[model samples]
Target: QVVASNETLYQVVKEVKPGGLVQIADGTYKDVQLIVSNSGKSGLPITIKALNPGKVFFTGDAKVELRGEHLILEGIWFKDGNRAIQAWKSHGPGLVAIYGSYNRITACVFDCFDEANSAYITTSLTEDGKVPQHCRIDHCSFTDKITFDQVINLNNTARAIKDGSVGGPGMYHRVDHCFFSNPQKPGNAGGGIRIGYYRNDIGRCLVDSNLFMRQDSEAEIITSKSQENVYYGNTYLNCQGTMNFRHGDHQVAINNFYIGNDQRFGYGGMFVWGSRHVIACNYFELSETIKSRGNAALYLNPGAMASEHALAFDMLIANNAFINVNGYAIHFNPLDERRKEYCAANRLKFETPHQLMLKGNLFFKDKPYVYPFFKDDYFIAGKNSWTGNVALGVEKGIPVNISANRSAYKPVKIKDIQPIEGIALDLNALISKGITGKPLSWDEVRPYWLKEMPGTYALTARLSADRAAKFKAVIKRNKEH
Candidate 1:
């Protein structure tokens, strides 16, 4: 079925059965609200797509609600969406909300959709309080989100935590192969992708293979809340902040790449909290060359209270490469003295990371005046174990080859321990390009349409006329540089 007008779009969609396709004609659509409530078979999903990819643009208040099973939404472009679906509300529906299982959203572009304090797309729960399963969001391009919320949000609040254990049969949602760039929110509320909520139930979701460029919205580029999620094979290019595990335990971060290209914007690698989380086989290169605190490639923060800000406990930081980093390869306890004193006086400070295992990691710095490891004044090395960790760097203009224990003044011998449960630990095969190619480039992660489309597509279809002029000016300056 072909839909040319909004008046007939819903009527056409009502007749679509399983394996049916409803195509929207290429043009500019406004005030488009679609509710897909029909179910499709497992192998034959219903599809609602643009007739011509990138030619169909939706402006103003456009939103979609997918409540049926086995659905696919594809090849749509949303630009200049200025409506707030839920102003200042956290759990409100996004521009696109998926409440069905085995659903997919792919090959879509969200360009400059300005929804303040709300997500652009979300995986939401149904009315009966059941969460979706096996949902996938892939091959999407999300850019210029200058708002105070995440670009992609996965909701897992349907299952409640009970008796110190999170809810089971996890969400298992997957978000992969997406391109996210340039979110310029001034405060700390905006993020590229956020999974679950603070101290909520576990979201056993997988966020992998996405590329983030210049996502300097706030301190958290990707914020992982809840328990047992896996973040793997992603690339962060010159992003200002870290992939923060803000809450929950048993989370895993593996085979990711963070390359700064000597940018001055404090491109951090990872900041972690909670217990039993694994950080392994990742590559971090930020050669800012200046020595400063709070700029470590890997940061293990101290816990102020116990709830959401729990201490990093029983962690395995293993088999990673930190190349020419600006600050310490691993920083333990990033709290300053005054804050530490305040926590001490209030009796809110938990002990530093206990039972941590730092093993088989490589830290190499080619420059001078850089330390391999930095610790807080109260950090006790005897509390943790360090084994087979090597450091090669020039510190204070003197070349040194030392064990990480010698650098940090602390030290485990568990060679057979797997970094992540239920996953094979092949360090060579995982993150191979990150080590061999040295630094990840723009070609490695940009979306497929970026190379296929011309300049006018972005200047005319995505942005308004005044914003397009400014975008061109920025592009011209970049070309000159």
Candidate 2:
């Protein structure tokens, strides 16, 4: 039905049927709590949308909650005091609740909905143990106010929901081309994105090609804490955080570009902290050279064998470039309290080597500073390998600085370490090919595209164009409706 601009939103929504269109006109939906209570099929999902995207306003804590499967909620500007969904306060419903699977929320605006850790956007298993599957949040904008948890969270909160055990593993959520910046809300911590849990509960999502700036949080701009999570092709500018693999196994950080990152509060470029992780083909451009090898561009944390999965094992660091890097290009910190506490049995005297495969990496700089590759006061001997690396126009490359006890260092025998291809590189060459190191602006972030889960896609390429387009037809169809 062609609802009038002045009609109460709830009334219009209640009147709509399956495959129905509740065409909201350009007007104010005051105190509106839009609810999608019915289900739809694969080809036809029930939809609620504005006649024109910017034409409608939902003010004063007004929020939308999609409670069933195969529903589409598009283009309603959720501005100011809009609370996260009720069914979602503890679920995947984030700021806009998405409780059921195969639902789509696209091209919407989430402005200043910061309830701090208690709110934001989310996707998860519903109350019934029916897992939310194949949901897509694409081309949306999250601006102002600090949100609790992460601005976007793809996780299964239900304790019973184990990986690949319930209904098939993975949330299969997509968060692509979204814009995030200045997500600071005073006393709280704000961030760009977070994926999955620490233990048996697994989350597989892709944080692809999005843009972020200065995500004001204690955590990372994008925290890949769960297994099978992938971060690809995104550009983070002045974001005071790394795309940290905070925990979990099999995480991938690749092909993303980071420029002028925050240098204070122990925040640097990237840190790998778990097993079977890959950090490759990314660009990290620091403004200067060697401010602190104690806080360098790329590095690793201590891994103890006590917890859920072994920490920092079998890592691949390759094909990455660092320009004007001030700190250590790669700094492995020494044994801390955590390592001392966790590595009891293995640390008394002997320990096995942690395998770090470093290959095809490039670096260019001004003065001779810290070690291109460095390991802190480990207090133990060499139990790792560093081989086949290239450095140019800089200080040191071969026989990477051994800051540890040298006499005790090589006793464990640093295997196949060195034999680097040292020389200069054409720093301006990739520029002609358009790898300009520029800060990514907000408007440049949310350029109408999407993805996250398909927990399956983490180790693979994005969903093809034809495949992604089928999910994009909602906006046009709703505008016409």
In candidate 2, position 418 carries an lDDT of: 20
The reply for model 1, stretches above 4 Å from the true place, is 84-90, 158-169, 289-293, 304-306, 336-349, 395-401, 404-481
lDDT of 2 by residue, 160-185 (tens): 43443332356657677777654333
- The alpha-carbon RMSD values of the candidates against the true structure, listed in the order shown, are 6.5, 12.5
> lDDT of each model, Cα atoms only?
0.70, 0.57
Q: Model 1, 255: alpha-carbon shift in Å?
A: 1.1
Task: Tell me the number of clashing residue pairs for each predicted model.
Answer: 2, 21
Give candidate 2 regions above 4 Å deviation.
Answer: 4-8, 15-19, 82-93, 114-117, 159-168, 183-190, 261-267, 288-294, 306-310, 334-338, 341-353, 367-373, 379-383, 393-444, 447-481
Q: Which ten residues in a row have the lowest lDDT in candidate 1?
A: 452-461
